Amino acid sequence: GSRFVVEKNNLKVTSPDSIKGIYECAIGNFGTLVGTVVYPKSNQKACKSYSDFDISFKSKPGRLPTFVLIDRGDCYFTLKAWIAQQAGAAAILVADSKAEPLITMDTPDYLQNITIPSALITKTLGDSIKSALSGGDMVNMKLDWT
């Protein structure tokens, strides 16, 4: 089957209240955690090393782990997950570039070494998160890989 499996009650936005709720996502097969979402200002498709930009997603001690929001395009989803993992992300969310069913997004080497949770999300949810972040809101999220 597909390497990303659609799940109905596995992603919960916990803050801000404007977008709080439960949303569908497609969880990667390779691969509960609460994290804070960041949308990088560069290399937004995660097809090149974040270290070339001097960008790190490792959280400070005592702070929420960082979930990186990544745009679909230009490279395979597994490479995006590997690259965010090397940058210290605790998980990755890849937002679709088109408005369409999630199951359509996952179309037909280091894959055995990906260890962070990975999920695909819709364009609508990606845009909502980006809007919340752009306004100054912290976006917190709970992933459940059950």
Binding stretches for Cl ion (CB under 5 A): 3
Residue number, nearest CB to Cl ion: 3
- In the complex with Cl ion, the residue whose CB is nearer, 3 or 142, is 3
Residue 112 CB, nearest approach to Cl ion (Å) = 8
Residue 109 CB, nearest approach to Cl ion (Å) = 11
Helix ranges (DSSP H) in 75-122: 77-86, 102-105
- In the complex with Cl ion, the residue whose CB is nearer, 3 or 45, is 3
Residue 113 CB, nearest approach to Cl ion (Å) = 12
Calpha distance 120→72 (Å, rounded): 9
Calpha distance 129→10 (Å, rounded): 17
Q: Contact at 8 Å (CB) between 142 and 14? A: yes
Residue 83 CB, nearest approach to Cl ion (Å) = 17
In this structure, is the dihedral angle defined by the CA atoms of residues 43, 72, 34 and 83, taken in order, positive or negative?
Answer: negative
- In the complex with Cl ion, the residue whose CB is nearer, 39 or 77, is 77
- In the complex with Cl ion, the residue whose CB is nearer, 84 or 139, is 84
Task: Measure the N-to-C terminal CA separation of the chain; round to a whole number of Å.
Answer: 18
